[PDB]
Design a binder for this molecule. Structure first.
Ligand SMILES: C[N+](C)(C)CCO
Length: 284
């Protein structure tokens, strides 16, 4: 084999590892996507049956989180009068939204018990983007990392939001949420080539989601136009070069992570020395 044939064979093997690594992340993320889609369908059916009960929708929301231990939280939020048409009945009741909106989320307490809460920032620009973005865009959305308090501490999280669309109109939205600690666990555990390489993940905006350097989490990618352009376009990207700083021939292969119908894929990378991939091409 010529030097270009050997490069291609290692590059093909690496690209296959990056592809199956990206799919493993997609499978874990799909737990949130499917939970949110399934709850949306369930509450559309509940509403279609007429005179829907908030307590039943709350139970469906609690059950959805209980079924998925890896999820941080889930939320269910409706437009004014869009669930039961009865918001005004709740204004004077304790511990309701000030205008009686049906706006709830669930998390777990320190015993693992699912707990129900009111959403309070769902129309606040910034913190409320988990609701404001699917309302504006009227499609599935994956949010850039943001923090919110759970059990007295700030947790850095992402949300996959699925709008409640009926006849092409927006009635509300559901999220299923992951902590970034959970996402780092998933990526840091890939351990490509039995730990001889490492995996990284970036958001659609180029923020680090997972990286061996935990000081980078949620910071933006800098000084890599080809990679950033690939993330923006949702295209795979492979590169190989001799790193004169580390004195190793290094390979990098990036594969988009598809998230439902958001159209805004994240990006999984595998970084590994060429020698490691060549040795695996032999062990074949
Ligand atoms: C994190 N919030 C609870 C504020 C919204 C997503 O569930």
């Amino acid at each position: 084999q010529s030097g270009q044939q050997q490069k291609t064979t290692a590059q093909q093997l690496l690209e296959q590892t990056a592809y199956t690594s990206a799919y493993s992340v997609q499978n874990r993320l799909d737990v949130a996507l499917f939970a949110a889609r399934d709850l949306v369908q369930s509450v559309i059916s509940l509403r279609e049956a007429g005179a829907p009960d908030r307590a039943t929708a709350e139970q469906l929301l609690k059950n959805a989180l209980k079924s998925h231990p890896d999820l941080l939280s889930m939320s269910l939020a409706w437009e004014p009068n869009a669930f039961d048409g009865k918001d005004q009945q709740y204004v004077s009741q304790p511990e309701q939204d000030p205008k009686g909106r049906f706006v709830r989320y669930v998390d777990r307490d320190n015993t693992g018990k699912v707990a129900l809460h009111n959403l309070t920032d769902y129309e606040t620009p910034g913190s409320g983007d988990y609701y404001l973005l699917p309302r504006k865009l009227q499609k599935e959305v994956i949010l850039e990392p943001y923090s919110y308090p759970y059990n007295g501490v700030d947790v850095l999280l992402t949300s996959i939001a699925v709008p409640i669309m009926i006849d092409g109109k927006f009635y509300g939205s559901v999220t299923a949420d992951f902590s970034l600690d959970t996402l780092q666990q998933m990526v840091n555990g890939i351990k490509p080539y039995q730990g001889a390489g490492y995996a990284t993940m970036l958001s659609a905006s180029g923020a680090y989601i997972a990286h061996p350097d935990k000081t980078r989490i949620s910071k933006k990618l800098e000084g890599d136009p080809p990679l950033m352009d690939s993330i923006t376009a949702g295209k795979p990207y492979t590169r190989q070069r001799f790193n004169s700083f580390t004195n190793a021939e290094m390979m990098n292969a990036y594969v988009p992570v598809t998230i439902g119908n958001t159209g805004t894929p994240w990006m999984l990378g595998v970084s590994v020395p060429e020698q490691v991939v060549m040795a695996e091409s032999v062990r074949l």
